[PDB]
């Protein structure tokens, strides 16, 4: 059977194999995809091909290596199929008609497959280019428009010869284009073409083989485009954003403009781009929504993806010696920010939050270019943010939520510039305290900030005991001076500070971590009692677990005795139906990091659970609801589940005290909604012994695995971020000792259940506190089978 193997193959790409065998495999799937005559799972075969020819399988490009390794595929087979979609005379036989999904959907696939196998059409059959156009062209007429154009864009190879190049065929595209008015049914193909072709010429010019038979394609002012060709596409794109809204996926529609820039002859182009930003200016304004606000947004993003796209492909090549003056200069990155800054700032305030997240996400792309301008953006974003935390926007909702998104999509970058980074302790301990219990939304957007700051920062006291320290005296005074400066029109380039004072501010800024976590934990227990739900309950647990991993033992060992402390002495689990998750799980993540903390935490959950049972908890029967006199017992039981699951080998110490407590928990305590809970204890302890998992996630290891203490932006940009001595993960591997207790239990609970149930087979049909008990033992049995699931072998029955 074909389809099966075609899959086990997919499974095999996960390790490696010889390019000489890809030559083979690719050839199989190119010709396989194009079968006719039976039921075929094409989507699969076109996908094998597309993954076998991947152009970025971990920085490796397999289309290059397959070209170089002698792969050549027949174009007549592909074009011959894509042409059955033409008007076959005698209607009685025409098989394919666009319009009707089932058909258009095949066509869209062949076309995709061709695009994939375009580079393996014989560069050497000189008359393959000309022959193929001279055929499609004669086929072009109003009734074919729809099927011909797309073909061209995905079945004709970008060749370039001495006499007949592919850009030879441009003057004909700007004959159709420029004759109909903006029509997405047409344009989309023109942009796809002159763009994936302009991308080509650029790619080819750099590093590799600057040829393909002709470097006889000159770049200049406007990419491969005439003066009038460029001029036209500009007024057409303006037409789209201001008048006729005719574009789809814009990634494609932007290419031509990006790949027509010439680092040494921009000027004349930037002149054209500026006037296109000044036209478009008003239509982005937050109170001019219309049919256009989508196109302008989906474009200003598609364009700044597809520019940063190019840049990070060239900077990968000037890591190969080859500058090329076609390349994008430090001064393009500058004039790009000049252009799209008011534009991006207006869009981000827009009334639609989706149409805003487009303009807001552009800040991250611009900052990666590390332009000289970088300050202009950090300047806005930080004022907008500090204003918001000073309630200066309280009348306007959007500005508050907006300028918290601006700041989040840019936190990681601020942790770097040695000036801004100072603010980051303040801005965090401010977000934490401003976590609202009434505004579900503001809180989701604050956690966003709080978790991002934690994901790229080590919660660490970085003071060498330097006496001047303190947050005031040394950090606050500077932070206010920077802000005063920034607010009065001045920029941060004009801001002069002593490298001595600014490093006092930075180090003294790392003191507040302690006084701020006492305020985060407080805000968590307040949130245990809110009808926030799901999405946001989870995201909050990520922030509590990320905050933990970015913590040195000094601070963490504090955080621990602060969860421990507040978990017991709290007045915070009243309201009906609580989010226990928000507090039990953050405990488990303490025990992951420090198994030693378990020996005593568990024995306290048990002499507090036995306490609640003994005083009538779970005495009163009910399906459907958890009785509120139980809520306490349920806390301690969820904690015991969540915290055993992460106990691991430290559970070997108090093995016998557990099992005998578990048997106690099932002798006493019957109640269908509590039994779905108590029966999980057995799982969270079998899974923890034999499940093979990670254990260490710290931002920086051991407390000491010194990269030094210039260790902020989490090495996220340093190339040492991944040499093996940094990534020294811990891992729990099940030892012969653990598997052995693992099994002791399996048989001891397995028996306990089967006995107590083989007993109740002296049937009381009434009781109903009987069907409660049989359900109990069958749940304990069940969760005894899971977690303990890693010890079983599918194959055992063969042997």
């Amino acid at each position: 059977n074909v389809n099966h193997w075609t899959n086990e193959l997919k499974n095999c790409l996960h390790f490696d194999f010889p390019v000489a065998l890809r030559k083979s495999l690719a050839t199989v799937y190119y010709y396989l995809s194009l079968v006719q005559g039976q039921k075929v799972y094409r989507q699969m075969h076109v996908d094998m091909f597309e993954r076998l020819v991947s152009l970025d399988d971990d920085r490796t490009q397999f289309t290059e290596l397959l070209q170089k390794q002698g792969l050549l595929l027949d174009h007549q087979i592909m074009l011959n199929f894509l042409c059955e979609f033409l008007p076959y005379p005698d209607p009685d036989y025409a098989r394919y008609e666009l319009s009707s999904k089932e058909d258009l959907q095949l066509f869209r696939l062949l076309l995709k497959h061709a695009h994939n196998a375009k580079p393996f059409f014989d560069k050497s059959k000189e008359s393959l280019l000309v022959d193929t156009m001279n055929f499609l062209l004669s086929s072009l007429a109003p009734s074919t428009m729809m099927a011909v154009m797309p073909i061209v864009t995905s079945v004709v190879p970008y060749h370039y010869h001495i006499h007949s190049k592919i850009i030879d065929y441009f003057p004909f595209c700007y004959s159709i284009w420029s004759s109909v008015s903006a029509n997405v049914a047409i344009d989309t193909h023109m942009y796809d073409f002159v763009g994936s072709i302009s991308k080509d010429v650029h790619n080819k010019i750099l590093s590799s083989e600057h040829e393909k038979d002709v470097v006889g394609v000159e770049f200049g002012e406007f990419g491969i485009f005439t003066d009038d060709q460029m001029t036209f596409m500009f007024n057409r794109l303006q037409g789209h954003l201001r008048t006729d809204g005719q574009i789809h996926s814009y990634s494609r529609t932007v290419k031509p403009f990006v790949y027509a820039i010439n680092g040494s002859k921009k000027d004349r182009f930037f002149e054209k781009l500026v006037s296109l930003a000044k036209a478009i200016e008003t239509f982005i304004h937050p109170s001019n929504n219309g049919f256009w606000t989508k196109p302008n947004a989906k474009f200003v993003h598609a364009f700044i993806k597809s520019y940063h796209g190019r840049v990070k492909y060239e900077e990968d090549i000037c890591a190969r010696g080859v500058t090329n003056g076609i390349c994008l200069t430090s001064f393009c990155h500058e004039e790009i920010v000049e252009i799209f800054l008011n534009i991006i700032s207006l869009g981000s305030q827009n009334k639609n939050p989706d149409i805003a997240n487009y303009y807001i996400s552009c800040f991250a792309y611009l900052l990666e270019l590390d332009p000289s301008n970088a300050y202009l953006i950090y300047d806005k974003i930080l004022i907008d943010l500090y204003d918001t935390l000073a309630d200066q926007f309280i009348n306007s909702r959007h500005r508050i939520i907006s300028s918290l998104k601006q700041f989040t999509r840019v936190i990681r970058f601020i942790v770097m510039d040695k000036l801004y980074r100072v603010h980051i302790t303040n801005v965090l301990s401010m977000l934490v305290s401003k976590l609202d219990m009434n505004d579900t939304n503001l809180t989701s957007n604050l956690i966003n900030g709080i978790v991002s700051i934690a994901a790229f920062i080590p919660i660490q006291d970085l003071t060498g005991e330097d006496d001047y320290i303190s947050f005031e005296s040394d950090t606050l005074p500077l932070v206010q001076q920077h802000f005063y400066h920034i607010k009065c029109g001045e920029s941060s380039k004009t801001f002069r500070v002593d490298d001595e004072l600014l490093n006092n501010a930075f180090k003294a800024s790392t003191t507040v971590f302690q006084s701020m976590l006492k305020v985060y934990v407080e805000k968590i227990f307040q949130l245990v009692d809110v009808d926030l739900e799901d999405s946001l309950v989870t995201k909050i647990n990520q922030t509590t677990m990320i905050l933990q991993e970015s913590m040195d033992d000094k601070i963490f060992n504090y955080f621990a005795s602060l969860l421990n402390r507040n978990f017991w002495s709290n007045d915070s689990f009243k309201e009906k139906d609580p989010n226990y998750e928000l507090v039990t799980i953050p405990l488990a993540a303490l025990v992951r990091r420090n198994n030693g903390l378990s020996k005593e935490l568990v024995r306290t959950l048990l002499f507090h659970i036995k306490e609640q049972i003994k005083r009538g908890a779970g005495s009163v029967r009910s399906t459907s609801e958890i009785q509120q006199r139980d809520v306490k017992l349920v806390l301690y039981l969820t904690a015991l589940n969540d915290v055993l699951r992460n106990c691991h080998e430290s559970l070997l110490e108090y093995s016998d005290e557990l099992i005998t407590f578990m048997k106690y928990l099932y002798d006493n305590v019957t109640n269908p909604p509590l039994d779905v809970i108590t029966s999980i204890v057995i799982h969270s302890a079998l899974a923890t012994l034999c499940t093979t998992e990670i254990t260490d996630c710290r931002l920086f290891p051991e407390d000491s695995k010194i990269p030094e203490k210039d260790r902020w932006g989490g090495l996220q940009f340093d190339p040492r971020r991944f040499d093996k001595q940094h990534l020294s993960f811990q891992w729990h591997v099940p030892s012969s000792d653990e598997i052995t207790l693992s099994i002791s239990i399996l048989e001891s609970l397995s028996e306990y259940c089967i006995n107590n149930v083989e007993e109740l087979m002296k049937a009381p049909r009434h009781d109903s506190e009987y069907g409660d008990m049989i359900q109990k033992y069958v749940l304990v049995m069940t969760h005894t089978l899971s977690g303990s699931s890693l010890l079983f072998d599918p194959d055992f029955n063969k042997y």
Binding site: K23, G37, T623, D793
Partner: protein, 333 residues
């Protein structure tokens, strides 16, 4: 043999495991739990037929015992105490930038790779005598009359055909016989249930491939086109109509550039006679199927020409001989 490898503790298929006391210890225990679940099922269907809460808890104890073998798939995804790989990726990854990750992320990413290497291990197997006994039970339950029971059992028998081999065969050769029964035992709500079964994604799909049994079945769904009393017959028509839209057969020599299989042609001499042998069996397997449909074609035209008047589901036939006396890839007009 083994290409997945996940630190199975008892050694990766070395049968370093077979010579391990700790490993016969373990499965001898899952056997008892299996034989005990049957002990309890027979004890309930006998003493407690009119209970839903009991049978649900047992049907989950089987969704587990049948699946949580190599892996852990129920409970698989509950927020637990590990940071989520998908979350962290959003926070840290810029695009057009190779893995700009902090140490924290690299660590879940790796844990996430181990955990996926575990789930890779195909748990698909041969039915274990006792495993066949419990799959027969899970059917008498998806064949039960209480929606509060038959609906989880059906969902539970689907997670069980993902896990057993040609288990669809076991299921049909139990359905049809006990549907033919529930018809000559009259208006049963057991007919209403059996029809609900036949509409399950995984079954309704394997139906258009069962050439043997779809003979007998269409004639049963027809007898069923009489609301002797219920929503039946409305369901029997949706089902017989769903059927006309599947099935067919492909004779036609895959118009293949013979270069679709050559590049992978082994040196092996004529140890590729095998290929021209398969070509021949997958060619009379086919020709038998093609004949089964013609047999069904003519055996219906019988019930249409000879049955003085059946009424307006006179329609199934016509809606079908048509996608047949005009298919090609054979079809003798």
């Amino acid at each position: 043999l083994d290409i997945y490898t996940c630190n199975y503790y008892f050694g990766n298929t070395t049968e370093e495991k077979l010579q391990n006391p700790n490993y016969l210890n373990v499965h001898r225990v899952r056997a008892r739990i299996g034989h005990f679940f049957h002990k309890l099922y027979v004890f309930l269907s006998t003493n407690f037929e009119n209970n839903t809460n009991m049978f649900q808890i047992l049907l989950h104890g089987l969704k587990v015992w049948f699946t949580d073998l190599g892996q852990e798939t129920v409970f698989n995804e509950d927020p637990n105490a590990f940071i989520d790989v998908d979350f962290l990726e959003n926070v840290q990854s810029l695009s057009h930038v190779n893995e700009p990750f902090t140490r924290t992320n690299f660590a879940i990413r790796a844990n996430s790779l181990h955990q996926s290497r575990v789930l890779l291990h195909s748990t698909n197997r041969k039915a274990s005598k006792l495993e066949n006994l419990l799959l027969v039970d899970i059917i008498q339950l998806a064949t039960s009359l209480y929606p509060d029971i038959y609906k989880p059992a059906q969902g539970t028998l689907v997670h069980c055909m993902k896990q057993l081999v040609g288990s669809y065969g076991v299921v049909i050769n139990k359905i049809i016989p006990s549907l033919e029964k529930a018809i000559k035992d009259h208006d049963y709500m057991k007919i209403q249930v059996i029809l609900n079964v036949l509409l399950i994604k995984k079954i309704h799909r394997k139906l258009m491939t069962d050439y043997k049994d779809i003979g007998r079945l269409i004639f049963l769904l027809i007898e069923c086109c009489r609301v002797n009393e219920l929503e039946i017959g409305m369901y029997a028509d949706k089902i017989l109509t769903d059927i006309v839209i599947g099935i067919k057969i492909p004779s036609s020599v895959c118009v293949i550039s013979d270069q679709a299989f050559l590049p992978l042609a082994p040196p092996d001499g004529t140890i590729n006679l095998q290929v021209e042998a398969v070509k021949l069996a997958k060619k009379k397997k086919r020709e038998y199927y093609l004949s089964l449909l013609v047999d069904l074609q003519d055996k219906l035209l019988d019930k249409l020409d000879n049955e003085k008047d059946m009424g307006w589901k006179i329609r199934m036939f016509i809606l079908r001989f048509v996608t047949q006396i005009q298919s090609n890839l054979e079809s003798k007009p």
